[PDB]
Amino acid sequence: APPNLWAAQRYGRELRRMSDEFEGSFK
Amino acid sequence: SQSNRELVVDFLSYKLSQKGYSWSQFSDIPMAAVKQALREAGDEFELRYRRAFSDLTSQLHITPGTAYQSFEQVVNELFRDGVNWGRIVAFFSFGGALCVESVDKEMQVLVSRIASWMATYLNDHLEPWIQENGGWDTFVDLYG
Numbered sequence: 529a530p531p532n533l534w535a536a537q538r539y540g541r542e543l544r545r546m547s548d549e550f551e552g553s554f555k
Numbered sequence: 556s557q558s559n560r561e562l563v564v565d566f567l568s569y570k571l572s573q574k575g576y577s578w579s580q581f582s583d584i585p586m587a588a589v590k591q592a593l594r595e596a597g598d599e600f601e602l603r604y605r606r607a608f609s610d611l612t613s614q615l616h617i618t619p620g621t622a623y624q625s626f627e628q629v630v631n632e633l634f635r636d637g638v639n640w641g642r643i644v645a646f647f648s649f650g651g652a653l654c655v656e657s658v659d660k661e662m663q664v665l666v667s668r669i670a671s672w673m674a675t676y677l678n679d680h681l682e683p684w685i686q687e688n689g690g691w692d693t694f695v696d697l698y699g
Contacts, residue, residue: 529628537629539615540628548639549641
């Protein structure tokens with residue numbers, strides 16, 4: 529993917545990290 | 556599923572109304588408990604991770620021209636590894652923040668387009684996992 533989409537990639541990777549932590553927060 | 560497109564529409568409308576906008580300004584076992592859990596899960600996620608939603612339109616250089624690619628890049632990465640209920644909530648909030656900000660920056664055209672991308676993604680890549688996991692009732696139970 530071109531550089532113009534790498535930011536969206538890093539953002540997605542960070543998003544995954546925050547939601548995995550969120551996931552781990554469930555009952 | 557139409558219930559899935561209904562989940563997307565419900566959630567986005569909620570997020571939009573939440574900022575003064577109305578979903579109708581851009582578009583032509585129970586689900587009530589599901590819509591509610593998602594709404595809450597979304598608010599909590601957006602609250603605990605405010606940073607990831609600050610200036611999304613800026614964080615991604617979003618335009619009606621690059622919107623789809625950006626959307627798909629974020630989402631394919633988000634689920635690159637697989638699926639969790641957590642990522643699914645993240646998926647919803649992301650699309651929601653995306654719409655709210657598109658409207659804020661005179662790109663209201665993206666709203667319905669985003670909904671379509673979400674529903675399509677929900678139905679094609681998430682639905683199998685959802686069902687395999689017991690359906691949305693499982694989320695309602697596992698969340699709050």
